[PDB]
Amino acid sequence: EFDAIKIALASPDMIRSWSFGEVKKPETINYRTFKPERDGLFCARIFGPVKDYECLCGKYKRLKHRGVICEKCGVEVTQTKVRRERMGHIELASPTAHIWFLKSLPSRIGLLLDMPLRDIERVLYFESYVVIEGGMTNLERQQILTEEQYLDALEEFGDEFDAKMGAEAIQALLKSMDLEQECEQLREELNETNSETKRKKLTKRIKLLEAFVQSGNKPEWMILTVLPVLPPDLRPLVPLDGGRFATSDLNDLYRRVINRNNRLKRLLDLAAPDIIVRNEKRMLQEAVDALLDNGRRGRAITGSNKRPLKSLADMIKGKQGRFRQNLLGKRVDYSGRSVITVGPYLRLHQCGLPKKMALELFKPFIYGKLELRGLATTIKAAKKMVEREEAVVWDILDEVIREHPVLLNRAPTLHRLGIQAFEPVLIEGKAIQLHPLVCAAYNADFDGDQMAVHVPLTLEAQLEARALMMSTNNILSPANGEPIIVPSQDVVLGLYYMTRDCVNAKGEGMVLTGPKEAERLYRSGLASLHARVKVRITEYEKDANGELVAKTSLKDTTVGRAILWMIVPKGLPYSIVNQALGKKAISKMLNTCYRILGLKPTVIFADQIMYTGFAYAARSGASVGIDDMVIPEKKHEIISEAEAEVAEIQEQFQSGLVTAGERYNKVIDIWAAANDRVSKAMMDNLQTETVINRDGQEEKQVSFNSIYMMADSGARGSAAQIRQLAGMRGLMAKPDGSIIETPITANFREGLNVLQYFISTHGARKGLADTALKTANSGYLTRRLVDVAQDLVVTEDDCGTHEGIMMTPVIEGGDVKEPLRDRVLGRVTAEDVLKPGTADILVPRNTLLHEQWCDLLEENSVDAVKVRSVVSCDTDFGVCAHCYGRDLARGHIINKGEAIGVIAAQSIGEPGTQLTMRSSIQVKNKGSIKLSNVKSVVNSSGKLVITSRNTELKLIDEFGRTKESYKVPYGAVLAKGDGEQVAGGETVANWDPHTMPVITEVSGFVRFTDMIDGQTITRQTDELTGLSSLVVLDSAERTAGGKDLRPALKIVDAQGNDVLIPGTDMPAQYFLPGKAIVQLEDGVQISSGDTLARIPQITGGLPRVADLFEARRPKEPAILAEISGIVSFGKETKGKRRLVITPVDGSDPYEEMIPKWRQLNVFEGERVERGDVISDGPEAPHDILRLRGVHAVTRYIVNEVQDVYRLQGVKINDKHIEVIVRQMLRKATIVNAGSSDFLEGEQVEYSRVKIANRELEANGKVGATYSRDLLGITKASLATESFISAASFQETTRVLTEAAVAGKRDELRGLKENVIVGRLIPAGTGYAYHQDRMRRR
Amino acid sequence: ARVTVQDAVEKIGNRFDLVLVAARRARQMQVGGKDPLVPEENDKTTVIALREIEEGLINNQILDVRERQEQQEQEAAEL
Amino acid sequence: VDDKMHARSTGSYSLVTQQPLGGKAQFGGQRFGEMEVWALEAYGAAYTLQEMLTVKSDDVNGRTKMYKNIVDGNHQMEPGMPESFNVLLKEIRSLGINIELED
DNA sequence: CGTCCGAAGAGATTCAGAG
DNA sequence: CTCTGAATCTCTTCCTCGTGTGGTCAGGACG
RNA sequence: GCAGAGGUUCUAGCUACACCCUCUAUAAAAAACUAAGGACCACACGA
Ligand SMILES: NCc1c[nH]c2nc(N)[nH]c(=O)c12
């Protein structure tokens, strides 16, 4: 129907047009009559008839009188929906300002008038006079005058002095104000003004005034002369609370406003005293203020059960607010809830649905089928038949239930898998049954969990459900290309019992014809499940593409593994079943099945796995018992030894040898060591404890203990839980975070002491509360991520952008945290991937990386692959399909139109519940050590000491890959040469992190240039060295005279001729910071490369992720050099340490106000590159984006987010974070206007400025210059072009005011405001409709 | 009955497009008096439409040709 | 399970014309909230989302129509415009902000 | 029978001491 | 000596659904 | 309700989106047609 939604400030004439009447009387209705009052808040004449087609008089009824206003009633007969359709207005005796424009963050009305807000509420609430049109008087028109000062000015000046009070005074001020004249005045002022803060204020004001100029809005329209009133259906006031028929709501606020307006009108009519008139105007203004927005005033109108009365804005905004309350989430028909039940007998695609629930859910379908059958002649008869519940109705239900898929929704829908459609199967029980494999996908349990069940109706809806919603379609989680239907608890245990080996069991050593014979032997009981036999296996190999080659061979496997082989389809190899088949093993099996065979064979395989696992787990008879728990015999001895050690440390503390803190640390260390020893002994006596006679000598075998079976198989509970169960629980930190000195030495099997239980409950309650706030913060973060990244859909198949992020495995030096295979999987290459051998192109320029390509890269050991990213694609309001890569859920290139943004937001948000809210370079293995960006000078010993602090020690193995990568600081000693093989386990570098040695460029003696001992920096004895040292004093440490002179260490010859630094004419002078230890005195020689001076020297959970996505400024951000240049001190840390950085080619030096206390990582006289860290600290993402490229900040933030997630063991593909990053930097600031229409001091969407740049490049015009600007997810969502979408996220008031003032017009086209509108969204099945609609323009 | 749509997505690459093309065929089968080309094994119209896509009997281009042919047939009926 | 089991095909609606009143005591339907909307939104689900938003929640004409179509045997959904959106429009217009659907 | 009577994070707001 | 960055003073959010219980104004004469 | 009028029934039933029948001054012979007022706040519980 409509094509775009338009919002603008409403004029009083426009309001009169909407209104059909004026509400003169406050009382809404006469309760005894239950009839709308003639001038009342509910009036049939003003809005519409209370009873449809009934006049208040009742003279005109239904048809033949419809549309005609009977004079006596005064009400036109119309449908009752006209009540909510038709609006009204209330005349206000005093014009009253709209609080939303009156009070806001930037104070629209205050910003226009250049007046402090305080003056504004003073004049609005009649506390002072604004002297409008001072004229001949000294006061100007805009000034504010005090009441007594107003009287004095009246005495001094008469008709010329025209100070006035109230909202109408401000309206007159705005009317006198001219938009265009003040616009050019502001432009001239901005040209003249040279203060960037004053310039910022002027830019804000000029943007506001230009928004008024372009939009059809008037400043005086901000003050409401006429106040519209809500329709009566919207505020029905018809609660019928036991005949009371009354309640306290917005109607009360309207009543108060009308009462105040009537009082003011009658006071004006009666010529009331001016003080009383102004007080009444204050009351009316406050009433309208609270009505439009309660709490903006600062005083909340109350009296509804002594609770704040909800204002119209309050209904408009927040979860209570309708847009969140209903528009975003609407309750639906054909829906129901019930508890969950397992019912394994169901197939994966189908589910269990209660018989009674289905009859209610599918009742319209049942009525239709009955009518078509002719069993029900009429629909009323069909309704009666459903109530009767005759057998015929149940047969009709079976037909409707057969192919209408039902959506099953878990209560917290963190991810898309939360809602999955299933084919409903009628069940006698009153509980919905969910197939067991998909229960893990839902993250739901059977602890009375409840699922909402919805019934899609239309053929489009049913086809959509079957095609996409159905569980069989979503084998792989959208977050990671891994099976989300991985077997969870019982089937994995049953398979692990099945796929297990025993040294000796009945049937061992037999030869079996086939897996069928293995099953027959097992059922006969002649051979146990876990006895090894020599049985042939006919495995089909998919080596021929699309052809199965049968191979039959004798393989030494257990009977159980042979039986399970029947379940496995022909394509898969037999090696996968030959292992123990725990949880990761079965997940890998399912992944291989999906990769090699089709999805349907994978579904059948998964269902057969579940059935076989449940059956053989039941037959296994796995059981947990007290005797099953094993307590190591060495546990008590270890505990006694630990207690003796603790007593020894206590004696040392009493003797005074060890301090209280050191004693506490030693106690913690020894208790941790004892806990580790207890755990190791328990594992040794649990995992391999069983010794079984094996046709001869007894042989130790992996133990069949049920609890160890559960832990090792991964069915449920890690090794830590078992260690808490049978081994001593260990150290339990008290709630603040400090570890209790005495741990819990008693395992759960033994009785825990009362104090031990109290200590444990400390941490237990801490964890429970922290988990509650985890859920809260995870919900908030998920909402923010959805709102910022809602407007992301695949719109172009291929951008063709050659640019892309560089993808490399991440290594912290200890290990390769993320292998390259997983990171680049399902990602289209940015360019041709050449072999490490030069000029050999292994991978083409644009090819999607499936498993074969990723393996091929691994064989050729391509360490670094440059790959396309969503940030790289040049599509506006969309993403390249190739750039996004694989769908990660269907194992192929992302299909056009799929909404990747919401997928990624849900994928990131979901693990937040699991996320917890609260030197010597060792080389692992032999390889070539490599140094990059290294500035090292050999010392007297010849070992390499590096001035550069950006250099990294990335070791390269024989294949060419970076096995380990390390970082060395300023003046870091390097034991082994660069580029040569180093033996595993040796220390490559041996710097001391505490010290900060400064290397010497040229061998010579030191000289005191501004380092004179007498003025300051006097020799201070160093006890550890045994020699007095001329330590340089810090500015606060030294006297005022010392601050003026900046120390410079000149190097000279024996005679005294200065020795220049190599490559530069100036003598080698080293600028020494405060507290730098200058051990060597004047006239003491220093060898080249030796140390001339030595300078002595974060959240990991969900808050860290929130900080990263919000791009919040760290407390001490690391300073980065704006441009390559020479460093020097502008000031001696006077007020703020001033730093000058000037390049040789660039005249203009970047200037920084570095804090005095902050340590300077860079040497004072050092020459550094752009983006190099200047002060040690957390790097600011905004600075990273400004200095480096968008690709570099993308890599930084992705790495940090993944590292936070990698700690908790949850894997998320990088593209999910990447799209959120792309949405974060959607807004781009323009460096220079050029020929573009946008002013240089403006921020516009990067897409729009890119389109403008393409337009200017196509013709003969200057291209625009834009600086990419990182925005927090909350800010980016709030700053989106679609004002409806921004209002949905947060802070509806500010967004609505900004849209109204600027006259913003949303062109829909966003994935969310289409949800609010309710039309087709530009999602997968709506993208075609949206593009057809757009081309229809 | 088609419990897996993977073969149908092979026939229509977009998959989301497969829902739209199947919907038009299914609407023709139910609201209109259009014979199911695929044999009906006690199947609802939506499943028959999916089966027709898997068979290759119905594709977006084929549906368009049949609709155009019906429009020509209407002109012949007008005479 | 007797208390927690609930379902409705058609039932009484509120003043905001959200057809499901909500809650088991009243004959009310489960809230298809923001998380559920985003879940279907991440999927290719558009027709189901549109149907749930419009014809199953708030359409004075669509809810009545859809019922007639289903009892007639054809599952055709008339989109219309949600009544809650008109409520939003009238409320914002009452606040003094001219909000309108331009063509 | 009407009928009047913490918390945390962030954006304005001072404000200010310093080059 | 007029604006630094810095201290200060309001504004907005702080999951997501169920299920039960309850309690509720404006505003009384008045011709 | 062909327009006016009356209407079997299967609450009420020319509009709610409505719809059909017979009849000529006024009701009585007949089958097929269709969804209802619930606001707010606290407590508790379950996920
Ligand atoms: N709503 C119309 C109506 C009222 N009584 C009726 N009786 C019959 N036979 N037919 C009808 O159509 C009606």
Ligand SMILES: [Mg+2]
């Ligand atoms: Mg649960």
